[PDB]
């Protein structure tokens, strides 16, 4: 009944289209939740999409001024993958930060809400409020904003608390049926570890995070699900994945330390490893969240100074808006497949013809077959959408 | 299959956020039922929210003048905790008063409707109309407006009939699979008993009610399920929980009798006991239903003249509107947890910029871990919503 992700990793030559929600296009006619910070997670049967909704729909008077991320009204919305966030959507907890697991028996939700300084993280398992934690650093307590990973019933959640421009305490929480059985403080070469995209690299969990201080490369957190021992490093590839970043001709990594290059304000993203090569995805624009491309860097997980790209794909066209992206793993028949989701942000703070901010999602999964080209933007026309 | 609630009570140091529905905020754009008098109850798998809907949606010409509580159109709506009362909501009985149990096998609904003088209470079990009762005092027959409790299949419902502000008759009905097997008249020191919040204090049921006659303290009804013997008293803590109530500096209790202080009206609320201490919740205000705070009074279940709080929480801010609140118990892995819900009322009878009255709900559950601070109001802006 429990899920141990024991199978190998599927052979990946690229990613194929899997899902699209068309949330903003449907919001023009119809009642659709205003969301942001989405992700995807699958129970052993099918896959679900999650988002942090601002407590209102888009054709709503309350949809104005929704660019803020921490309000008493944001909740965690869950549907099946594909069903748009209509008014029948079940909102499963009060949260302005969130993460979600399925251990093979029941869903686990980690939900952070409350005052910025003093905040509360509720751990909900099988429809019960099983546990709760308070801020340790008395700052904005926050978590992965994507799925967490369970192995043999022990789930792992990475939670950060503190300032970027300051001392940030990151902890890894080991949860069993909603109860926190252990808590390990982060240790290693990674100074900052925010918004981690974790995947089960059996026998452990590997997370690729964002650095918001002094880094355009991504941190790596290796959690031993068993000994509860944490290792930290940085993604070693010379083509770094954060944004803002440098221009590829002029870029670099350190494989241990931040690169100290355009390291000011990252974007959540993902990466994983195929042998020595690294499969990664990033925005096509190097400064704004415009476009989204995935590719493979040869010897990028074990050699800085590698800039051999391959199997490049353009998921979202370079002139179209993207945002947070993340990884989730799906148990196949004989191996473990890796999929990713991209959040396509639309609205205020970058397009001043509307008063709201919302997102759509586009989901791709790895494939051992062949694939073509394309581009799957959000498609909403904000110059007409109702005002 | 039956549910006995045999486990101990969970260690409670406070309450953590569990759910929020954002009904009024979504009603500005959407099809949400005009409700009031909500509650929460859980089958052994998940939790459900119930409400008494006025037979219309907020943006509907019929939302006009919905401050009345007894109309032929109010029905009992049941969704899954979190799903807002959209137009797909199943309305499970005709009722302007209601209560609901789950005995581990099927749902029980007690629904009161009819003319105020001569009224009928239908008892519906497993989707059948199993039983029915008429008013005994030929007055407004009414019930708990929250969940009832079943132990060994025998469920218990407290029903009052009689004077709004005078002596009234109260009975405790013992139901088995929808059939009323016994009926005990209330006996003890509690004079007026209404809108009870009951919880399984194994081996029996303990209910904390409201005194609408001569008290600002809450009555207590101890029902022993096996011998159908009823005991009545008052909540003994010096910090009384009904509203209207007197200042904390000058409030009193009797532990047997009404305090005769600001006891004219009241509000439905809850309280339970942790050893000698009492965990309770009330509105921060003592004359209006504004705000909501929960705390613990030390030796408050055994000693009057005790005004020693601890573990105070502010669930709803002092300047924001609250209403009915109630308790419901959730069976954990090794103990029984206590949760409460607060009804956030918005509209006519106070805010005269709209013609309707509706409510939202906010749900908290007890925790043995730590928690922070916050405030989770309704959040609707009625200056911009349709009248």
């Amino acid at each position: 009944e429990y899920r141990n992700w024991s199978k190998p990793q599927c052979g990946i030559t690229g990613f194929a289209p899997f899902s699209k929600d068309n949330s903003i296009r449907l919001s023009a006619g119809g009642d659709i939740w205003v969301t942001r910070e989405p992700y995807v997670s699958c129970d052993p049967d099918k896959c679900y999409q999650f988002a942090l909704g601002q407590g209102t729909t888009l054709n709503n008077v309350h949809s104005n001024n929704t660019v803020r991320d921490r309000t008493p009204y944001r909740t965690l919305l869950m549907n099946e993958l594909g069903v748009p966030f209509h008014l029948g959507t079940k909102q499963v907890c009060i949260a302005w930060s969130s993460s979600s697991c399925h251990d093979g028996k029941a869903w686990l939700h980690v939900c952070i809400t409350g005052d910025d300084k003093n905040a509360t993280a509720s751990f909900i398992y099988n429809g019960r409020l099983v546990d709760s934690v308070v801020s340790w650093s008395k700052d904005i307590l926050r978590t992965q904003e994507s799925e967490c990973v369970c192995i043999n019933g022990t789930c792992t959640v990475v939670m950060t608390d503190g300032s970027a421009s300051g001392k940030a305490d990151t902890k890894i929480l080991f949860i069993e049926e909603g109860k926190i059985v252990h808590t390990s403080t982060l240790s290693g070469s990674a100074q900052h570890v925010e918004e981690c995209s974790c995947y089960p690299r059996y026998p452990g969990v590997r997370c690729v995070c964002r650095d918001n201080w002094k880094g355009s490369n991504r941190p790596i957190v290796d959690i031993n699900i068993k000994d509860h021992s944490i290792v930290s490093s940085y993604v070693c590839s010379g083509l770094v994945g954060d944004t803002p970043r440098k221009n590829d001709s002029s870029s670099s990594s350190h494989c241990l330390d931040p690169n100290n290059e355009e390291g000011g304000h990252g974007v959540k993203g993902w990466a994983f490893d195929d042998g020595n090569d690294v499969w990664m995805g990033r925005t096509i624009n190097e400064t704004s969240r415009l476009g989204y491309e995935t590719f493979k860097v040869i010897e990028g997980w074990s050699n800085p100074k590698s800039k051999l790209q391959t199997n490049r794909q353009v998921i979202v066209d370079r002139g179209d808006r993207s945002g947070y992206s993340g990884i989730f793993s799906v148990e196949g028949k004989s191996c473990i497949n890796r999929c990713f989701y991209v959040e396509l942000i639309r609205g205020r703070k970058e397009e001043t013809e509307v008063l709201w901010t919302s997102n759509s999602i586009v989901v791709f999964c790895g494939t051992s077959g062949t694939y073509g080209t394309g581009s799957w933007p959000d498609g909403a026309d904000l110059n007409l959408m109702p005002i | 299959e039956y549910r006995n609630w045999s486990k101990p009570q969970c260690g409670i140091t406070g309450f953590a956020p569990f759910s929020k529905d954002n009904s009024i905020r979504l009603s500005a754009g959407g099809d949400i039922w005009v409700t009031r008098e909500p509650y929460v109850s859980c089958d052994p798998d998940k939790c459900y929210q119930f409400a008494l809907g006025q037979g219309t949606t907020l943006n509907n010409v019929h939302s006009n003048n919905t401050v009345r509580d007894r109309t032929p159109y109010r029905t009992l709506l049941m969704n899954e905790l979190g799903v807002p009362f959209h137009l797909g909501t199943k309305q499970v009985c005709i009722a302007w008063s209601s209560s609901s149990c789950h005995d581990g096998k099927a749902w029980l609904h007690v629904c009161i409707t009819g003319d105020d003088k001569n009224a009928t209470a239908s008892f519906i079990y497993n989707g059948r109309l199993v039983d029915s009762v008429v008013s005994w005092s030929k007055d407004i027959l009414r019930t708990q407006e929250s969940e009832c409790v079943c132990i060994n299949g025998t469920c218990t419902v407290v029903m009052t009939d009689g004077s709004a502000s005078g002596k009234a008759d109260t009975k405790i009905l013992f139901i088995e699979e929808g059939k009323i097997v016994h009926t005990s008249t209330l006996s003890g020191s509690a004079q007026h008993v209404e809108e009870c919040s009951c919880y399984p204090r194994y081996p029996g049921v303990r209910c904390v009610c409201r005194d609408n006659w001569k008290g600002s303290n809450r009555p207590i009804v101890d029902i022993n399920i096996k011998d159908h013997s009823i005991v009545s008293s008052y909540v003994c803590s010096g910090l009384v929980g009904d509203t209207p109530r007197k200042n904390d500096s000058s409030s009193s209790s009797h532990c047997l009798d009404p305090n005769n202080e600001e006891g004219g009206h009241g509000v439905k609320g809850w309280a339970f006991d942790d050893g000698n201490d009492v965990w309770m919740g009330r509105t921060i205000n003592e004359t209006s239903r504004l705000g909501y705070e929960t705390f613990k009074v030390i030796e408050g279940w055994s000693n009057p003249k005790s005004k020693l709080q601890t573990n105070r929480q502010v669930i709803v801010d002092r300047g924001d509107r609250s209403g009915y609140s109630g308790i419901f118990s959730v069976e954990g892995k090794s103990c029984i947890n206590r949760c409460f819900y607060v009804e956030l009322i918005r509209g006519r009878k106070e805010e005269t910029e709209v013609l309707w009255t509706s409510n939202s709900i906010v749900v908290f559950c007890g925790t043995s871990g730590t928690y922070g601070t916050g405030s989770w109001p309704d959040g609707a802006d009625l200056n911009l919503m349709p009248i």
Partner: antibody
Framework: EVQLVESGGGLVEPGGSLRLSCAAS????????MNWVRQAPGKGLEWISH????????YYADSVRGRFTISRDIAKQSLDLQMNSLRAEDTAVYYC????????????????WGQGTTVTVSS | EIVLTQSPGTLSLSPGERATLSCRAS???????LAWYQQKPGQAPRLLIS???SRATGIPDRFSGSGSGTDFTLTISGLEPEDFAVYYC????????FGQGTKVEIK
């Protein structure tokens, strides 16, 4: 039209006390962190005090620490600053301001400022 | 004391052109915490830029600040009659700190 409004400044002899009040509607003291920032006549803006969203964590600049307190009272959702043991160095145009810090975007900025209250400390 | 020096004492330029104002920090400050305000003498300081690149609502896309590391710059594509005002850096933190003040003048 209407937003954050501050008042309560006046001429006091040095060594006196004063209380400054900023009150605001919609641009609430419930949602944003608030900051008092002053400007000496023809000098650079100097931030003096910061109050969190819950009105618990309080920070003061070195210049005014120990003589000034920024506090909030529920009255009309408003915040005040109590100044005691004033000096001639405190003549300024005091400002109240609101800020937020996004965990994904960073400092929002003091988007909304008051009109300004003129304080001249002299004998 | 992370002292933000706004490097141009004054741009001192002729109207209808680009204006490039600077801002240098003592130590490496993350670009997230930095903002740019326009104080026209006599009125409240008006926000222009947040997070060192993000523009404020109601502010035209003409103003485009950038920078990183220790140094940041504010660039104005075209000066117009209103643009002539003092421009301040500001950095979130304990404590906040403003800049000494950069003016832009006619001719």
């Amino acid at each position: 039209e209407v937003q954050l409004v501050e008042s309560g400044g006046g001429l006091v002899e040095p060594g006196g006390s004063l209380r400054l009040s900023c009150a605001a509607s919609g641009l609430t003291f419930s949602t944003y962190e608030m900051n008092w920032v002053r400007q000496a006549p023809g000098k650079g803006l100097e931030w003096i005090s910061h109050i969190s969203s819950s009105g618990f964590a309080i920070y003061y600049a070195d210049s005014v620490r120990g003589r000034f307190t920024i506090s909030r009272d529920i009255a009309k959702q408003s915040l005040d600053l109590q100044m005691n043991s004033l000096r001639a160095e405190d003549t300024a145009v005091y400002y109240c301001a609101r800020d937020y810090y996004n965990r994904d975007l960073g400092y929002s900025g003091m988007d909304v400022w008051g009109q300004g209250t003129t304080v001249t400390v002299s004998s | 004391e992370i002292v933000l020096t706004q490097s141009p004492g004054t741009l001192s330029l002729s109207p209808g052109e680009r204006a490039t104002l600077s801002c240098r920090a003592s130590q490496y400050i993350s670009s997230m915490n930095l903002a740019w305000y326009q104080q026209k003498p006599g009125q409240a300081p008006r926000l222009l830029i947040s997070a060192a690149s993000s523009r404020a609502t109601g502010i035209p896309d003409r103003f485009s600040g950038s920078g990183s590391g220790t140094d940041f710059t504010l660039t104005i594509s075209g000066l117009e009659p209103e643009d002539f005002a003092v421009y301040y850096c500001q950095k979130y933190g304990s404590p906040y700190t403003f800049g000494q003040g950069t003016k832009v003048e006619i001719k």
